[PDB]
Design a protein around this nucleic acid. Structure first.
Lengths: 192, 193
DNA sequence: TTATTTGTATCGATCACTATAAATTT
DNA sequence: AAATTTATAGTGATCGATACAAATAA
């Protein structure tokens, strides 16, 4: 029939940016439909609802900013170099302006009304996946021999995840890239 | 002179702060605030002027009643390392108590939002800068006291621990068990120079 | 009488979300 | 045409913030 005037993945990209800056509940459909360059009935045709548009923008954000994480981790010769390389590239992405500062998963919905709890729980489970990414790379380190067998991998993974999440708050606070890279270097001194 | 106010203004302020603590600034609807404060809208505005003003008063209340331990724990410690350790250990305790909302209001209440509330977002961001400054002040004392080296980068060390501190609000909100978060604090202190 | 607080009822604006039909197709 | 996306123009509900008058003090 009549052709579609927008490109799906491009409207999904602009919806992702608005969420990245205003958050899930902070993003009105006025601001969204303005960014995507579509009209409300077009938006609800492709995405179902505001929540459905966020879940698709989350999957979009993740595939474009959450797959580079495991590539850097497993591409390093040791678990310590993986955590170092991934924390350094994260600080780079957190401090260049090709994107907004900080991670969408950390910033988009930490608190809110009871109505948007499903969205908040989604971002919560995704933060647990960051811990799992760390913990999985440490399991390889113990097997490769570069990490002691009696290492508390859950504590080490959670510690560096705490630092990872904290860097989103610091990047949003406009802390310079040089100071964030010193945080990463200092956090590595805690390695066993 | 006039009709007397029928609510404790100190108690109402506490109840707004508890709603802001869980729902954030924009998430706290005026229907929800007046419901917890147990008052009605025109009273709220007579007392606090506006939602923004009510949060700004709730913030100062939260800071003096739930952030008073920070300076005390920091100052009463015999070394800079013990003050940072004890502050984080105490923060994890409060962050994981069954008695208060998990995490810190300052980090959780307004990280992102509409352009209308940037004044509130910058207020909380300035208060997070104070957390960095508060650590920095203690390390300053540690250099004079002798427990810290006279050439230590006070900002680099304070900012690192402020990063760990902010991340603990997110982990507390994610209901990470308390023993886990104390292990995190111990690991972070291993990075001390 | 005056002064301040109270509950009620409502404000204009904005929220997320659609009915409806013209526009553009094979 | 028959199919499908478009834009206009709204929906009721809720947002933050009030006009008003009964109530209650000095």
């Amino acid at each position: 029939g009549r052709p579609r005037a927008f490109d799906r993945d491009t409207a999904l990209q602009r919806a992702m940016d608005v969420f990245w800056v205003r958050g899930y509940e902070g993003a009105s459909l006025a601001a969204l439909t303005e960014a995507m360059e579509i009209r409300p009935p077009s938006l609800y045709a492709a995405f179902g609802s505001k929540e459905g548009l966020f879940r698709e923008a989350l999957a979009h954000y993740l595939g474009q900013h959450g797959r580079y994480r495991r590539d850097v981790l497993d591409g390093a010769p040791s678990a310590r170099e993986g955590v170092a390389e991934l924390l350094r590239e994260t600080v780079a992405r957190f401090t260049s302006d090709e994107f907004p500062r900080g991670s969408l998963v950390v910033l988009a919905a930490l608190t809110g009304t009871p109505e948007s709890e499903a969205v908040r729980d989604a971002l919560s489970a995704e933060r647990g996946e960051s811990i799992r990414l760390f913990r999985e790379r440490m399991r390889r380190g113990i097997a490769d021999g570069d990490l002691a067998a009696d290492t508390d991998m859950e504590e080490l993974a959670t510690f560096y995840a705490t630092v990872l999440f904290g860097l989103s708050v610091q990047a949003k606070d406009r802390v310079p890239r040089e100071r964030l890279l010193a945080v990463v270097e200092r956090a590595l001194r805690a390695w066993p």
